[model samples]
Target chain A: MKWDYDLRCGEYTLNLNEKTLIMGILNVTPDSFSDGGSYNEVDAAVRHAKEMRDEGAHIIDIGGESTRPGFAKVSVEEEIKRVVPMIQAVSKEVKLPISIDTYKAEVAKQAIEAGAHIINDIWGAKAEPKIAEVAAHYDVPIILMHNRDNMNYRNLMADMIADLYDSIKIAKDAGVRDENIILDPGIGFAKTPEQNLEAMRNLEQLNVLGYPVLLGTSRKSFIGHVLDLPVEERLEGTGATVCLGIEKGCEFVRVHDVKEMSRMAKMMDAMIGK
Target chain B: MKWDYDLRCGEYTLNLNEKTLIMGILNVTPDSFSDGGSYNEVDAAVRHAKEMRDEGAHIIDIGGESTRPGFAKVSVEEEIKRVVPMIQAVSKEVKLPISIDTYKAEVAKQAIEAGAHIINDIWGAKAEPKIAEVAAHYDVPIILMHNRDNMNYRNLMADMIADLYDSIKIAKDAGVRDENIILDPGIGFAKTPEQNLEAMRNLEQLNVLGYPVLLGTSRKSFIGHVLDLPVEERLEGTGATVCLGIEKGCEFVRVHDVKEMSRMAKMMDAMIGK
Candidate 1:
């Protein structure tokens, strides 16, 4: 049976409506990859989330980790400290569903208690087995990202495809339902720029995994690479990629500029939605 | 035989690529319809033009006339004084082509002498016979627009098709070459908002006239009425229309935000291009 109910996320209820949903990113870390944490404060994060809400964002995702090139490992306690308050306030104020962004089981547990309804695990159960297990405890939903210890895919496409397969088995074994698992191709995380491009071009392979694919190419360096523009200048570039993701069957887009990206997604849905 | 060469207009060359060109709007008129001339200076005009140029604008449309609702028209001397210096300065400074935004033959004549290349006549040659005559004499490109009295068409699509047909006759009778004429549905001109929507939706019918179709729906009130958005928030709305126009055989889009719209056009071209 289809998940027909509207799930209350943060301040918004996401009605699947037989089309893809949008999750706008508002990283609270002081060192996010694209925006450099300009909106890292509690109020800044809330304002950004509110703006995305105005832009028709279906969900708000608050993350504490940078998850970009040369990332430093933040302790679970520190990550929780960074994102939980903002998530709590945003959940209460924005009137949309809130997704807690974490890779640690403890952080995930605390974030969910703090009002986050979805577990966005960047490692897809690879970084720490207990993360998916914690998400399984919540029985909500988990974004099982496509990541690796090393992006050493023998045939990158085949390897990445198989990696998603590995993640699915991990989630299933952890008692996470197949419907609750969403796949992200990991545009910026732990992949070379070339590998990111390869993943972007061959996203259809990931789509065949029989799971929803989430594209997180919002202000990713890959867009800056393709357009030779800076982060702020890549909105249209990001719009292009989001439309491409929609056309190629991605179910969600994790973006920083939620309102504009959401608008792009809606317009793209008009032309390309099923 | 394809018209294969670029024509020099203002500071830039009006590129006659095999595909149609993109002209972004640069309104320096500060009024109810550019009323008080708030945007009436050389620097203000040039800054706006530069922004559009960076957005991949093929033509910089500098309009001094206030044809917006309830807006009174400026004197010919005031219009010339407002637009000519900016055109000459923008031509001297920027590399993008400039099209003098005028419906008068006298102003068009002066704008042409002031380094303006193309004549964007809003009157459809009926407002001033001398405008078409001047365009024919200079052999410069003319944008013949469709306008209905009170925008009440006997049949919106059929009337538009016929209006453009008569405008083409006017240009041709005045010796404007068939190849040098571009037809616009005139989104905000004398047409009802519904009529404009009909024009946008059925843009392909205008192509039956055998002229390059120019879609001037950038930031128009029709878009605002359709989407219920303010002027500052119509980029995505306009981009959607421009992309749709390309699908329906509109070769060019006259937009307000150039860079974003241009990227949109380029991406649309990439999709529809071989």
Candidate 2:
């Protein structure tokens, strides 16, 4: 429960007290900033993947769905159709593993078949029980995220931790190894803006669940509200959040600007680097 | 000889409780990012003055000559010629007072005559003692900066304090009232990049001198080095420095991005504002 961690992963270890990794956001969604939906066209996605790979992204998180407040949900086939080619191409081209950010089992399994090594389910394995089965069958890492349909809670911290424990049981019942699990507090996902801020501020408390931590604040609108800036001008705002996140014990960051956010993470690590 | 200030000027009232003002830098130099001689052209400077004023700058400190490394010194007449029109234009345009950032007495005198209300002398009156007399004559506030021609020192902090004490004596001899005199710790002036960081880190000790402390790190290279950012990408880095400065008891800040820095300062003050 104290400020400590037990990280076991690739040759590159996560020293809980020291440095954190900057996992650049590689969204293949249509309407994403910079490389619009060209990446959805496979070859364009591969080129963007190579560019970000050169830009120093530790892990490429390919998401087929747009999580914007007003975004329409993508069908299972459409999700797979959009993200599969890009994940396959990026996984083949880059040395780093690809993380499939979806809540569908079919999409996750297809992405794994296409070479994605991790499952980043936003609904914390609750949206699709079979997604946990895929992670269990493949024996790869799975990022179980926290979310709620409503912001009202009896006690936020307690409810969040209890829900994460329940999700851990879900992954466990599905035969997923505990060692191959990661947890995200799921900032800006279905929670009130104040609750999102609280989730980020007290992130270390979530580290109590004994899993690797992943924080994704690339160009979230929550950042825009903090400094009254638009999406284009959220780099500095995102930098503050990234540094604060790293300082509080998040191990992985999913950001939009790979090179710039990676540089900020390095500096934040250097400042708070143990 | 305590971390307190008794500041008063014409229609300007500032009562800070161990808090620092966020001085955002708005450089009018041709080489400065965001403002490339565009503002130094009077009309451009006037437009920028209103922009920074809205952005939350307390004082618009205008410098004609760039103090960047390998910079050629501009003659007094040229400096005055470049800044007078800007000072007059900005003063008439913005509600905040205009601070002339120069060491030449002629420039300071002409600036005050042109409606400029303060002198932010980077040379600490050592470059021109007559500049102190000009401040005394005009009864305007003067920022006596600490600069070392050869930065080799037995103790950087002690030496900087001794140098400031010597400058205070010069201001007094030139008839500048004690209350009218302010002190700048000179975060990015006359030191190596690392030394600049050390000065900012140790800036709290400057308040022991019992004068209104002014911190000028609006887009300085030290912040860029610390944050590994370029000239244009330093607002968050500057914000971090501003937060640190406010925590360290700095009374005022000289910065480039006023609105953002001002909001940062107010947020910082709200937390530790007491």
Candidate 3:
């Protein structure tokens, strides 16, 4: 079942019925999980964002805090300082929408004020409910990713869905509009390798929430674990997840290999949808 | 819904439940559609076969005739001359099973006598029923592909499935074992672009026939038409079809890009199967 929604993010309206949108990941942190602080400078970050836009990215997702396992948390001021300049530069230079990848309310608020168009909260607004208010205040879409402190679930799919429902309630309670909500299953967050694969296998269960689904299985550790491959050799594995995600009704994909994954998503859109 | 079968072909046994098998196409035809007659020579063909073997192809399908649109029909003797030596050479050089891609009984007989391990008839043994007899004689698997003379159909999926059933009956009547049979949907043959896409979309319907399914959408015109890409740029489109085909219970995939599709199939097998 493909979704039909026109999710508004600033000046851009993503029509989910047409094709799966590609959100290119731009990590600005020095200890980024994938890039390892390669593009931390504002100039280099803006160039990467422009390159991703040219490579068919519908949105640019800029992250400051490293979200990998055993990642060091940065203060909200440092996080804002890292992402705001890049967001401001990217928003002025690139024509695509920018998504702020952070769970801190102050970071989300500052990023939006500095020209970001969306808030992608990794904690799904549970870490800080004020982030939902920032989304509501900015009139932007907020991607509530499913995350937990531990993997002690009664049932994987049921508990995860219920957790997402709790996040949805938090968003609603903060006056966030229903249309402005997107859900990510959080492929590598707080889940074991088996649980990550199980989440991917049962991603369609998220459709019960009735929001546009965004899958972020791009170069995740579970793929590396399943394929027994390092991070660099997981392109085909990532492509498989993206293809299957589209078949299971995911409307958006956040990826780092923007050019290849954009082509893949376009081909999948042609095969599975219009 | 994955099928479990241990299909025997000469000295090789394909465990279908383990992973989706990759059949690398070794076109010896001078006017091949995708390779464009590049590896038509025996030495070049052998080199290409070894490369595909190293790239993780489980089977090498050697074809002498170009089945593309308006293809020139070669004589049985000419087809035999084109494929027999390559099969003999590749059979000795590569350890993988060799599948002779011919619809003629005489060609099948000569190729098998020259050490081919399987018969891959594009006409699904309907063109010459004796091909089934050759398979039964050699105790080898035969791939029955659905082909038609026109686009007219009462219903696409039902008609194709019935046509395949007829082929299965013909094989059975000729004493071919049930385990020594595979089914292909014939994606690029006698179907419109929309019909090709429709065939891919409804691939799961073929699972009702209870045979291991093989999909051959590698660099086909349907992908070209859908993605608006040329023959050289259809890798991602082909990857999409392969992933979706695996999800829909296809146990084998015949492709030209053996290395890339092998990685994609392995990744998908890990995600969908184990």
Candidate 4:
């Protein structure tokens, strides 16, 4: 309970200590967005946000661009153009916090201006240094996810800690507030499936940095490998990881199955540290 | 890694240490097994068992008599008459092991004659001591579930453990083999919702019995009370308990949602004792 941190996002504050928070993923790509046919416009995005909020999500993370390993890269202007209108439409639909999932400063700034409440930088501010500055300028919480281009780790946990330490320093150099910083271990980003599991085992060790850790193992490839399940059928694997993540001192869980994982996190938080 | 236990159930042996085994509950009654009307005979029961088996159930538990606290009490003859055909029909349909969920000696005897591989006694053989002898007669595994008429407890976990220890003594006295004995801390029977949570918190303490602990927290009242959700909506609450149950040394989980909770238990088993 002592590790509980309150995330101050503009006008709202989330008491992360009370329970493990759930941030629902709202991927608004042109294809395969809602696990069904195309619903990539503003109405569908707003409806999806409301659906997640109705399912008890604390935040709706809207991403316009696909950020997978082999995803086609999008420009800053293109990314901003893709996300801004959806963010604007969904801002009027849900009262819960909205997070823009991007690693570019210009996209973060424009999305925040379009009424996003948080910035989720997948590269941990390493890809574009100005992203942290945009978070600092808006005084919004930035989820700094640990990532790299290579699959090399002399020591997995130590190297990840060092990488996150540099991300923290980048946040500090950009004048971002300490209270506004959240760390994600970036499951399935750069590590192999085995290293991802090893990293999961050492999640509590990240508590030494004294930041609220946010876990994002929602329907990722690591779970696909471990359970030998496709991405379409990994809800229970994601549930297991989120429950374990909460047990290991994670304050927030980024997930795709908001209702199921939110119920799991609630029960798990009830049983943890008792 | 050390508390794992193996169950020799009749001609088949479940390597319980390898993963958390899921015992899917298949309840068949008069009005309607499903939410709709009709389909109460052998065909429906066999189809249900096959569905659970396909969904990853290691075992199928078929019960006809209602085991609720104040439910109608039926004669042993009527109980056997109700469950035998269902068990006999399902045994021929699915390859997975079939467990007869009954506490009556005559019912157990008839079911084993009809090809049931295991006996799940909710009364822990206290209702009918001959039930343990029946299990011993056929050399099948018996799951002695902890249950009480009153919900009084000065020390919940200690009293539950003592009760289960008494059941183990009964099994030994009745000549039930140690390798064929399993224990279950009945989640909703004779315990308040808070008491159920306390029992789950101390589930690892059940390891002192030196037997494989089978947990039955699927869609129970405690999950409904904890999350304030109905029985139809308690899957993820049950998911959280199954994960924590595995982490606390439970070897098998009795559940209704086989596909989801089996996936969850597999992932949690991979994470625990590492």
- On TM-score, the leading prediction is 3
Docking class of 1: incorrect
Candidate 2 has a DockQ of 0.13
Which of 2 and 3 is the better model by DockQ? 3
Q: Please, what is the TM-score per model?
A: 0.68, 0.71, 0.94, 0.89
lDDT of 2 by residue, A72-180 (tens): 4667766666677787677777777678888789988988888887788888989789999998988878998888677788888788988888889999999998778
Query: Candidates ranked by lDDT, best first?
Result: 3, 4, 2, 1
Score candidate 3 by DockQ. 0.68
lDDT of 1 by residue, A39-73 (tens): 45677888888998887787788777644433557
Q: Model 1 scores what on Cα lDDT?
A: 0.72
Model 3 chain A poorest ten-residue lDDT run: A29-38
State the lDDT of candidate 3 residue by residue for A1-274, as single tens digits.
3555588877777887888899999886353443222354777888899899999999999888544433456787666656778888899999999998888899899889999998998999999999999989888999999999999988999999999999999999999999999999999998999888888888999998899899999998988887778999988889999998998999899999988888888878877655
lDDT of 3 by residue, B1-274 (tens): 3555688886888888888899999876454443232354777889999999999999998888644433556677666656777888899999999998888898888888999988898999998999999889888899999997889988999999999999999999999989998999999888999888888989999989888999999999988887778999888889999999999999889999998899899888877754
DockQ of each: 0.12, 0.13, 0.68, 0.52
Positional deviation of A168 in candidate 3, in angstroms? 1.2
Pairwise lDDT winner, candidates 2 and 4:
4
Expressed as tens digits, the lDDT of each residue in B1-274 for candidate 2 is 3435555545565554544554545455453443322443667677777888777666777777644333446777656666777777777778777788888899899989988888888889998899999999989999988886887978889999999999999999989888888898877777887677677657878888878788777777876877667889876666666655665677787777776666556544433423
At residue B157, give the lDDT of candidate 3.
90
Candidate order by TM-score, decreasing, is 3, 4, 2, 1
Off by over 4 Å in 3: A1-5, A29-40, A66-70, B1-4, B29-40, B66-70
By the lDDT metric, which is better: model 3 or model 4?
3
